[PDB]
A paper describes a structure:
When DNA damage occurs, [name] can sense and attach to DNA chain breaks in milliseconds, which in turn activates its ADP-ribosyl transferase activity for modification of itself or other factors, including histones.
To answer these questions, we determined the crystal structures of mouse and human [name], and human [name]/[name] complex at 1.71 Å, 1.57 Å, and 1.98 Å resolution, respectively. Many solvent-exposed acidic amino acid residues are located in this region, including Asp235, Glu240, Glu243, Asp245, Glu273, Asp283, Glu284, Asp286, and Glu292, while Arg239 is the only basic residue in this region. As is shown in Fig. 4b, the C-terminal half of this long loop is stabilized by two groups of interactions: one is the salt-bridge network including Arg239-Asp286 and Arg239-Glu284, which also acts to position the catalytically important Glu284 side-chain; the other is the hydrophobic interaction between Tyr238 phenyl and Val218 side-chain, as well as hydrogen bonding between Tyr238 hydroxyl and Glu292 carboxyl.
Residue numbers in the entry: 35 to 92, 100 to 176, 178 to 345
Amino acid sequence: SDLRKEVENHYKLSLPEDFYHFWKFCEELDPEKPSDSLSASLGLQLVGPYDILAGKHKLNFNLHWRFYYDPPEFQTIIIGDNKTQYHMGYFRDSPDEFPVYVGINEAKKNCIIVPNGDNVFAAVKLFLTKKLREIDKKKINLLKNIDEKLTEAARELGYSLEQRTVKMKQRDKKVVTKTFHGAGLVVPVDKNDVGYRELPETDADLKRICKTIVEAASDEERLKAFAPIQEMMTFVQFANDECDYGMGLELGMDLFCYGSHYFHKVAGQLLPLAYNLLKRNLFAEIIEEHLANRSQENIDQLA
């Protein structure tokens, strides 16, 4: 329990039981280097809060293995090839609740968060099954052995292995908007529909607006191209005054997701405030620190 406290106090996030059970699974695979037990067969390595379990931390965990498009909800636990910057993370709607599922993102490809089961056994199972369906006879036998052991453990522990579980499908009903990442945003909406209001542009049209800002040819033209964004920020101010905090979280998230440093200032105006109004204060802290140092490479706080 002491080790658990260390892991969870460093991130100020509770970790679900599958996190700890999966460490033990990887310890059975390789007692000497559990974090690397899937490296040879799958190209995956356990990191993040697993670095603490591994003793590699013996310093801001808010930025540790936080890739360029990882929103504060997303906490990296597994990394793959740095050519695509494939990685898996727990996704939490609230810092005070357990992860709602495991998402994957390829940070050199896009900002999309792909849901991959609701626990890390599922996410690794799905990765393995895809790899098995692609490939080398020598690799297959090894993969099939890991698949058997992984599947047996999940069955003993009661963990679903589906990419989209019934639980995940129920969360879809509470998502108020997908955002650019596609993971979805969940905020309280009361019986009077207070809590969220939509943006006045479609996602497609918002991306066009962002494109014209990024491609502006001068400061003068960029200022003019920013007018639709400033207009939406005024709407967000009234939404905040009126307790529809989800609007500013959506606009700020989309601008973060678009990826341009030209949006860092307004994203820093939208997202900390939105998270603080939503009483998700840790996420306000993460996004502030990430916007201040949004690195594309060298995000390992222990290197």
